[PDB]
Amino acid sequence: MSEESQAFQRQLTALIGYDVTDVSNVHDDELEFTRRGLVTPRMAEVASRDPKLYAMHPWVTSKPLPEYLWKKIANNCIFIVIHRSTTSQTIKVSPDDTPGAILQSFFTKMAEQDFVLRVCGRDEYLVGETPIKNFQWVRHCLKNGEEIHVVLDTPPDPALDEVRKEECDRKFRVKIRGIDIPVLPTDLTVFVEANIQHGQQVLCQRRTSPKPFTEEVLWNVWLEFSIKIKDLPKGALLNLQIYCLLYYVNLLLIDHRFLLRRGEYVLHMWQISGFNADKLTSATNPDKENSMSISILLDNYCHPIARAEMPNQLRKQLEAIIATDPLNPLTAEDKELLWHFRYESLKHPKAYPKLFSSVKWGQQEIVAKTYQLLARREVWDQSALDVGLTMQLLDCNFSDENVRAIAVQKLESLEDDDVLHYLLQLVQAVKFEPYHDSALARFLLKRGLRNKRIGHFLFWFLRSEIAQSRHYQQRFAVILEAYLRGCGTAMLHDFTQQVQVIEMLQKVTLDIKSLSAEKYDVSSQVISQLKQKLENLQNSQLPESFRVPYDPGLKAGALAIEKCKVMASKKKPLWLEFKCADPTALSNETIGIIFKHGDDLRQDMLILQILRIMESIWETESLDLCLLPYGCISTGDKIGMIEIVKDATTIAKIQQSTGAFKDEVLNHWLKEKSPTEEKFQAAVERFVYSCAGYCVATFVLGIGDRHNDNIMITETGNLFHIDFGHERVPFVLTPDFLFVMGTSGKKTSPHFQKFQDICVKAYLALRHHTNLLIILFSMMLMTGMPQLTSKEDIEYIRDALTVGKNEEDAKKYFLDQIEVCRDKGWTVQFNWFLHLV
Ligand SMILES: CN(C(=O)c1cc2c(s1)-c1ccccc1OC2)c1ccccc1Cl
């Protein structure tokens, strides 16, 4: 291995945030096996991709243009302004015209074809055989009444993407020798609980006798289970837990080579913090100095893995079972029906999760029958892709490789635009995989390597978890390395630049962070001190430019140091502004970015992403709620970036121009921020729509009860919530908001009626996607929050979506929710100030 390759691994290590060649916290080679296993998948995808399309990464969709967007196009013509260079002309185009076609109706229309259209000031390209109405940037401009400005330039050199060349029928038993902890900080008793699990299902449980809890407790006792070795399903975990529940650790009973685990193990455990994905991890606690450890012995030898049509009425019970929601509990009777009528079940794709949860994973013969069932998968293969259904099969309830692989099989047909909508959830679902190398992990690798925008985001989503998840950083580091090794030198160089910038901002944040206090900073001393620290960086080691992490198409240049500062909040985040490093930009507007240290931004990324998914759902129903999910990216441990939405203030700040509350303050602000009455009327309309979206969206997620200071509005009428990092009211619809809609005091009016109608329409559009939302919500709680109870926490969403009711009871239910808010007025808002004292 050339000394060159070592310098390179060192580079990857710094991009990753973890050293994948570190073998301090392993007890086998699953991780190395996986690094070698992912070489093939990576190389195959690198060799399959088109160098040109990969270089320009056009962002496209197959979805039809929504009704509400055709409205802005009734002349069947679209005007593209080509600016190359210092000259320019506006060209009318047809929604079906291809970029190369409008280049034909150009070149000849004026009068060398080695050119391409690029969005001004962005690294965004309009290329490939696709109708222009099918480009996201084109739709983004229409939704915002913006003009489409493009520049004619030379295609990027694919050379810049060069990839560096690479080079027994016995019963199961386990002996628990003992446990050891360095320091015990009332003497309690302690015992060990051993479980055999599969898909969060205890097939067998054994306990040791209780013993005095001392720094070292020994048993030397065999725990014999009823399950036979031959019966162990692949992917089963031996879950070991210490009760006084204090600590846990897991060990895959069958390894990545299909071999039964054997030998001595000394496992360092995870301590419970006073149900979640972290509990299923096969990784051990990296902290060997201060953790509990448990020693065991496994002696097990083997090398395993070597015309009844339904009566009319049972069929009704079956269909009833199938229609229930993902959270409905399956009775023993239900499972027996699903299983007995296996072949009937296999004809309803929606039954797949319920049915596979009816399998006795602890019986070799049954698992075998299950694979037989899966063999004739015709119905499933021809079913229309149902994301909600595919995801149910990737959660904690399914440990079977084959069952999860057919889920992944359906994802294979998603277009890039959809992978982007679900990427973050798919990356989180890698946590439910029992092995490091898996079909889902390979799918993320492959889609990332096929596309620059997916790879860019895939990078940050993996780095965010690697930096702050001890339970999964090892598996995610291997996935990230595999991707880094095939994205190409150009991307590699881009990531390096982003990492240096954020690494420098930590240092600045941290040095600044020492001079400070809680609730009020001031310190004209520290701000003068900030500008100096930035000035020092500005010359270098801070790169000329870098891609904005949450808006990769944007290149930030030099800092506009005079506009930078430290924000006045509990945490002392930086408010940075940069010049755009693209001269072709269509403006002089700086790029604002809030960089913050001290908080885990992953809950906010997660929330924002679900908001983006709710928007896409509404799009499929021809609705636009005008939500505003601003960029947010967790970039490292307790640190990350946030987009500064331009021309925006806090709804509280507006009121503060304390504690009393006036209804017209908001309308006055908006009327005053409007250049014309026309713009003011548009702002009023836009507020109504955005207000409705946040009311529906926020209620469903059960994050509707917010303080005025966590809600903002743009001068253009766009309302939007912020800071999602973790009497009552379902959501916020205060008197001032009502006033803008022309109502007050249990009144009504055309905009207000328009509000209720949109809300209702928005609400029921989400109910047609009830299962998708439920599975995203529960996956979110398991993989993003603390130890959340499945039974009660996850059930909230079921009640909110009012599962079990028809449309009429639904409309009524939401309308009442709007009424509760009305009755409450300013009550709730006003009450928070006192909680502080
Ligand atoms: C958590 N947190 C946020 O989530 C923000 C989200 C946005 C912010 S702060 C913001 C501020 C000013 C102008 C535009 C903005 O866009 C959206 C936050 C709150 C207060 C101070 C700093 C931050 Cl990063």
Whether residue 575 has its Cβ less than 6 Å from ligand 1? no
473 to 39, 463, 464, 492, 542: CA distances (angstroms): 19, 9, 9, 20, 28
Rounded to the nearest angstrom, the distance between the alpha carbon of 812 and the centre of ligand 1 is 35
Measured distance CA(558)–CA(589) in Å, rounded: 13
Ligand 1 atom 4: residue of nearest CA = 723
CA distance 36 to 31: 9
Tokens of 651: 């709804």
Nearest to 29 by CA among 529, 597, 436, 354: 436
Q: For ligand 1, pick from 577, 594, 595 the residue to mutate: most ligand atoms within 8 Å of CB.
A: 594
Only one residue has tokens 């709680």, namely: 781
Angstrom CA distances, 158 to 55, 181, 520, 710, stand at 6, 56, 52, 45
**Domain 489-646 top-level CATH class:** alpha beta
d(CA 234, CA 254): 6
Which residue CA neighbors atom 11 of ligand 1 most closely? 644
Angle at 689 between CA 687 and CA 693, to 5 degrees: 110
Separation of CA 708 and ligand 1 centre (Å): 13
Q: Is 343 annotated as contributing to ligand binding?
A: no
Angstrom distance (rounded) from CA 708 to CA 721 = 9
Round to whole Å and give the CA distance between 238 and 192: 12
CA distances in angstroms from 546 to 4, 490, 768, listed in the order given: 26, 12, 41
Class of domain 647-830: mainly alpha
Which residues, in sequence order, are bridge partners of residue 726? none
Chain Cα centroid distance, residue 387: 15
* CATH annotation of 168-301: 2.60.40.150
Going by CA atoms, what residue is nearest to atom 15 of ligand 1?
644
Question: What does DSSP assign to residue 93?
Answer: E
Task: State whether residue 485 is helix, strand or coil.
Answer: helix
Nearest in space to 572 (alpha carbons), one of 633, 506, 656: 506
φ and ψ of 702, to 5 deg: 65, 35
Tell me 386's DSSP state.
-
Sheet holding 719-721, edge to edge: 648-650, 711-714, 719-721
Provide the 10 A C-beta neighbour count for residue 203.
21
Q: Is 607 in the pocket of ligand 1 (CB under 6 A)?
A: no
Is the CB of residue 599 below 6 angstroms from any atom belonging to ligand 1? no
Ligand 1: atom nearest CA of 573 is: 22
Which stretches does DSSP call E strand in 181-279?
A: 189-197, 202-207, 211-212, 216-228, 237-243, 247-252, 263-268, 270-271
Distance of alpha carbon 112 from the chain centroid: 43
Atom of ligand 1 nearest to the CA of 722: 4
What's the gap in Å between 603 CA and the centre of ligand 1? 14
Residue whose C-alpha is closest to residue 348's, from 310, 311, 318, 326: 318
SS3 for 814?
Answer: helix
Task: Find the 642 Cα to ligand 1 centroid distance in Å.
Answer: 7
**Strand order from edge to edge, sheet including 116-119:** 89-93, 78-82, 148-153, 116-119, 125-126
Residue 832: closest CA among 691, 694, 728, 702: 728
C-beta of 652 in contact with ligand 1 (< 6 A): no
Return the CATH class of domain 302-488: mainly alpha
601 assigned to a ligand binding site: yes
Mutation test of ligand 1: which of 642, 647, 650, 718 has the most ligand atoms closer than 8 Å to its C-beta?
A: 642
Residues 6+ apart with CB under 8 A from 263: 297, 298
Whether 268 and 288 have beta carbons less than 8 Å apart is answered as yes
3-state secondary structure of 810: helix
List, in sequence order, every beta strand (DSSP E) within 233-374. Answer: 237-243, 247-252, 263-268, 270-271, 293-298
* Residues 265 and 148 sit within 8 Å (Cβ to Cβ): no
Q: Are strands 189-197 and 202-207 parallel, antiparallel or unpaired?
A: antiparallel
What are the two backbone dihedrals, phi and then psi, of residue 449, each rounded to the nearest 5 degrees?
-75, -20
| Nearest-CA residue for atom 20 of ligand 1 | 569
763 known member of a binding site: no
What ranges do the domains of the chain cover?
A: 2-166, 168-301, 302-488, 489-646, 647-830
Give distance in angstroms: CA of 508 to centre of ligand 1: 19
Sort residue 82 into left (φ over 0), alpha (ψ -120 to 50) or beta.
beta
Tell me, in angstroms, the distance from the centre of ligand 1 to residue 518's CA.
18
CB atoms within 10 A of CB 804: 11
- Burial label, 496 (beta-carbon count in 10 A; 0-12, 13-18, 19+): middle
The CA distance from 465 to 463, in Å, is 5
* Ligand 1 pocket, residue 593 CB under 6 Å: no
**Dist. CA 627–CA 274, nearest whole Å:** 36
- C-alpha–C-alpha distance, residues 455 and 160, integer Å: 16
List all residues 6 or more positions away from 182 whose beta carbon is below 8 Å from its beta carbon.
215, 289, 290
- The three-class DSSP label of residue 384 is coil
Residue bearing tokens 């009660």: 792
How does strand 78-82 pair with strand 148-153? parallel
Which helix (H) or strand (E) covers residue 135, if one does?
none
Cβ 94 vs Cβ 85: under 8 Å: no
Tell me how the structure was determined. X-ray
9 to 335, 354, 390, 481, 587: CA distances (angstroms): 50, 45, 36, 9, 40
715 CB near ligand 1 (under 6 Å): no
Torsion of CA 444, 774, 433, 608, to 10 degrees: 40
Tell me whether residue 723 is annotated as binding.
yes
Write out the two tokens for 525: 């001393």
Q: Which residue has the tokens 């709730």?
A: 828
Phi, psi (5° rounding) for residue 142?
Answer: -65, -50
Question: Cα angle at 826 between 821 and 828, to 5 degrees?
Answer: 75
In DSSP notation, 522-534 reads --HHHHHHHHHHH
- Residues comprising the chain, all counted: 837
Tokens found for residue 113: 């074809």
Handedness of CA 128, 134, 137, 141 (dihedral sign): positive
570 CA to centre of ligand 1 in angstroms: 12
Which residue, among 601, 793, 832, has the nearest Cα to 706 in the 3D structure? 832
If you take atom 18 of ligand 1, which residue's CA is the nearest one? 723
Place of tokens 């004619």: 152
Contact between residue 190 and residue 214 where contact means Cβ atoms under 8 Å apart: no
Q: Which of 427, 404, 287, 400 is nearest to 784 (CA)?
A: 427
Ligand 1 centroid to Cα of residue 640, in Å, is: 12
The torsion angle over the Cα atoms of residues 737, 743, 748 and 750, rounded to 10 degrees, is -80
| Helix 312-323 and helix 332-340, axial crossing angle in degrees, nearest 10 | 120
> Does the annotation flag 88 for ligand binding?
no
- Of 198, 195, 305, 200, whose CA–CA distance to 257 is shortest? 305
Residue 414 near residue 443 (C-beta atoms within 8 A): no
DSSP structural state of residue 289:
S
Distance (Å, rounded) from C-alpha 559 to C-alpha 545?
A: 10
User: According to the annotation, is 699 in a ligand binding site?
Assistant: no
Calculate Rg over the CA atoms of the chain.
Answer: 29
Identify which of 703, 521, 506, 674 has the alpha carbon closest to the alpha carbon of residue 603. Answer: 703
Centre of ligand 1 from the C-alpha of residue 573, in Å: 10
Where the chain is discontinuous (C–N > 2.5 Å), the residues before each break are 111, 167, 185, 244, 274, 306, 657, 726
CATH number belonging to domain 2-166? 3.10.20.90
| Bridge partners, 713 (sequence order) | 649, 719
Nearest 10 degrees: Cα torsion 95, 101, 106, 112 = 150
3-class secondary-structure state, position 791? coil
Q: Which neighbouring-strand residues pair with 565?
A: 575
- Is the CB–ligand 1 distance for residue 461 below 6 Å? no
724 Cβ inside 6 Å of ligand 1: no
Nearest ligand 1 atom, CA 594: 24
